[model samples]
Target chain A: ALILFFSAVGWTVLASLIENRLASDIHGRPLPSARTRTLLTLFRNALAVIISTITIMIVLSEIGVNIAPLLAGAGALGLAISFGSQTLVKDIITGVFIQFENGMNTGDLVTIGPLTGTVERMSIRSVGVRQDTGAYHIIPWSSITTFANFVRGIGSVVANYDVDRHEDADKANQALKDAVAELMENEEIRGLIIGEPNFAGIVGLSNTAFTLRVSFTTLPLKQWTVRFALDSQVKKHFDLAGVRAPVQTYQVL
Target chain B: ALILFFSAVGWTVLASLIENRLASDIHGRPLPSARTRTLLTLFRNALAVIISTITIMIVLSEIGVNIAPLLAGAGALGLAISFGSQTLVKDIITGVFIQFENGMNTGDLVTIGPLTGTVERMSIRSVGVRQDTGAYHIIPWSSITTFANFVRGIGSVVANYDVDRHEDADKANQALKDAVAELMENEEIRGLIIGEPNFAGIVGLSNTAFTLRVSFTTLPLKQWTVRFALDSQVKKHFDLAGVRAPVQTYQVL
Candidate 1:
C-alpha cells in the first residue's frame, strides 16, 4: 500500500510538470492551457491502468499465485484486447495526433465529416461539435474522415441584396461606393475593413429584381459586424435616394 | 481468440446503439429535456460498465485465468483508483450534473468562472468555451466554480448617448422615442422588440457631455441587432434634426 500510494503521487507530480514544460516549449501554451489539457486527460487514464496493474500484482502475491503463469495469462489477454479492439485502439492513438497536430482545437468552428459546428470538446475517444442550429454532434475520433476549420485565421463572408431592375446599375454602383466611403470614416470600423468593396452588378436578373453582389474583406470574425453595419448604412441611404428594393407584388386574377 | 473477438464485437455494437439512441434523445430535449438526457446518459454509462466487465471476464476465461481471484483483485484496484483519483471521479460526476441541470449547453454564450465566452462543447470530464477574443478555455468539470448563461432567453440592451447639456433633454428623449417608433414600424424588427423604448434619465455627467441611458427589451440573441439598429436610426435622425451629439474636447493648457 505504501509503495503504491507513493508511486502514484510521485508519478502524478512528475508527469504534470513534464507535460507543462513540454506544452510551454512547443506551443508557448500556458501550463493549464487547452493544449496541455489532453496530457492531463491521458495521465488520468494511465493512472487507472497503473492502479489496476498494481492491484493485480499485490493480489497475486497475497494469494501465493505463481507470477510466471499470471504474467503469461495477462500477456495473452493483452494480445486478445489489442487484436479484437483494433479500431478502438486506433481511435485513441489517432486522437493523440489530432491533439498534437493542432488541426482543430476546442471552440474551433469546423465541419467534420457530416458534422458542422463549433468544437465543444475533444477526448481520446471522441469529439463533440455544436452546430449553429443548436444540435450537438459527438463523433468518434476514428470516424473523423475529413474536416475544415474556420477559426485558424480570417473567415470569409458573402452577402447579396436585391434591387429593382429599373434602377440604373451604374448609379447603384456609385451608391455602394459612397456607402463604403462613409463606412471607412467610422472610428469603430475603419481599420477592420481590409480590402476595397467590390460591386458586382446584376449577378442574377429576376423578373422583378437584380441581385447586386457586394464583396469586401474584413478582419477575422469582424465580417458579421461589418456586414451588419454596411447593410444598415446602405439601406438607409438607398431609401433616402429613392432606390427601390425588390418586393413581390400580388395581383387579383 | 474466438471468445475475445465475439465479446469485443458485442460490446462495440451495444455501445454504439446506446450512444446513438442517447444522442437522438438529447437532441429533442425541451424544458425537462435535461432530465431525460440525464437518465439516458446514466443508462449508457451503465451499459458501458457492463460490457467492459463482460469483456474482461471473457478475455480472462480465454487465457485460463482464475476469474474469482481476478475479480477480487479488480475490486481492490478500483478502490485504489477511487482514492488516488478522487478529483477525476468528482469531475465526471459533477459534469453529469452540469449537463443534466442544463447549466450550460452547446451554443450558449456563457461565462464559466473567469472564462467568458460561448460554450462549444461539454463532456463527462470537462467543459469547453470559446471566448470572443479568439481564445479557447478547457475547464475541468471539477473546476467549474461559477457560470452565467446569456443566450438562453431575453436580454436587455442599454445604449448611452451623450448630448450637449444646452440641448433640451425632453426634445432629445422625444427624438429617441421617434426613432424607436420608426424602428417598431420596420417589418424585420417589429416582432423582435419585447418592450417599448424608454429613457432611463441622466446616467452621468462627463467632461463635455451629459450621458443619457436608453434601454429596451429585445428577443434573445437579437440584442446586438436591435441595439445597432436603434443606434443607426438615432444617429441619422438626430443629425437631421440638428441635434449635435456631445463630443469630448480637450483644451491644451
Candidate 2:
C-alpha cells in the first residue's frame, strides 16, 4: 500500500511534467496553430481525466475493494453512454481532425458559418470567435461548416463597364488608380489601408460592360466603404473625363 | 431461434404502429414544424437501430456463447468510437433543432451565408438549396445561419427620399404614385402586382430621408420586377416632378 501511494505520487508528478512539455512543445514547433492550441487543450484535458480515473481506481483497490464488478460496470456504462452520446464522441474526433487539417491560427480571421471573426481561442470542443464588432461566438467544434481563410477580401474586385474592344483602356485604368489613391486619402479608413488602392487592367470585354478590378489591402468588414467610395468617385471622374458606364441602348443582345 | 425471430418480427410491427400514430399525433397538435419531420426521421432511424441490436443480441444468446463479454467489448469499442465523430452526432441534433425552431418552409427563398437560394428540400443531414442561378449548396445540418425570411419578397418596397421639412411633398407623392402605376404596366410583373402598387404615405421622417413606403402583395420573388421597374420609371418621373433623393450638404457637419 505504501509503495502504491508512492508510485501514484510519482505518476502524478510525471504526468504534470509531460503536460508542461507538450504544451511548450506546441509553442516551440512551427505548427499551424489555432489547431495546435485546440489540440493541446484537448489532449491536456483528456490526460487529466485519465490520470484522475487511474488514480481513483488504484486507490479503490488499495483500500481493499473488489474492483472487478466496478470494472465490469464500466463497460455497460461506456456502452450506454456511447449509444446516447454518439455526437459528443464525433464532436471531439472532428475537433481533432479540424485542428490538424484546417490552416488557421490564433488571431487568424475566419468565417465559421455566420461568424466571420478572428480565432480568439480554440478548445477540443469549441472555438472563441470575435468579428469586427467584437462579437464573441461560442462555436461548437462540430457545427463549424466553413473555416474560410478569406472573406469578400479585395484581392479581386470586379468592375464591369463598356470598353470598346479597342477603346484606350488606359483612361479606365487611370480613373480606377486615381479613385483608389483617393480612397486611401481618407484618414478615417486609411489606418489599416496599405498602399494606394489601384486597378488592374480591364480583364474582361463586353459591349455593355467589362470587368475592371480594383486592388487593395485593408480592413475588410463593414469596411466596404472603400468599394462604394471608389464607385462614386470613379463615376464622377469618368463623367468629367468624358467617359461613362455604357448605357443599355448601345448594348448588343 | 424461431422464438427470437418471432419476437423480432413483433417488435418491427410494433415500432411501425407507434411511429405512424406518432406522426398523426404530430399533425393533430399545433406545432411549428421542420422539427416534426426531422424528429420523425430521427425516431424512425433510432427504432431501426434498437430493433436490430435487440434482434442480434437475442440471436447470439440463442446461439449459446456468452454475449456479456461481447457486450462489454461493445462498450469499449463504443468509447473508442465516441472519442471521435462529434460532428456526426452534432449533425443530427442540429438537424432536429433547426427544423423545429426556425420559421421556414420549403420554397422559401433564404440566404444561408452566400447561398441566396430557395430551400428546395430538407433532410435530417442537409438542406437542398437551389439558387436563382441554380447553385446548389449541400450545407450540413449544423452549419446553417442567417436564414432571413422575406428577403426576395416584401410587404412592399420602401423608397425613402429627403422630403424637405415641408417642401413639395405632393410632387414626390405624385411621382411615386404614377411610377407605381407604370410599374404595373409591364406584363411580366403584372400578375402579382396586388392591385396596382400604391404608397403607404410617410411611414417615417428623418432629416436625411423621409421613409416613403410602397406597399403591394404579390408573388414576392417574381414581383421583385416591380421594384426595379418602379425605380427606372420613378427616377424618370422625379426628373419632371422636380423631386430628388436629398444630397446631404452643407455636408451635414
The most accurate candidate by lDDT is 1
Give one digit per residue, the lDDT tens place, for model 2 in A1-253: 5465547546875787587667767666775544466666666776676566556555566677666786667666666666766556565655544543223457765666556778888765778888788668878765765455442222223344444332345676676667666666778767655556544455443323444665555554433565566678877777766666644432122
Q: What is the TM-score of chain A alone in each candidate?
A: 0.58, 0.47
In model 1, which regions exceed 4 Å deviation?
Answer: A1-253, B1-84, B113-120, B128-138, B249-253
Q: What is candidate 1's CAPRI-style docking category based on DockQ?
A: incorrect
What CA RMSD would you report for each candidate?
Answer: 17.2, 15.8
Instruction: At residue A134, give the lDDT of candidate 2.
Output: 66
The most accurate candidate by DockQ is 2
Candidate 1 lDDT over residue span B31-77, tens digit each: 22233343455456657766777677776676443554457545544
Could you tell me which residue pairs clash in candidate 1? A120-B120, A120-B121
lDDT of each: 0.65, 0.59
- Report the C-alpha lDDT of model 1 over A27-92, residue by residue, as the tens digit: 545543556557656765665665566566656755675667876676566545444565565466
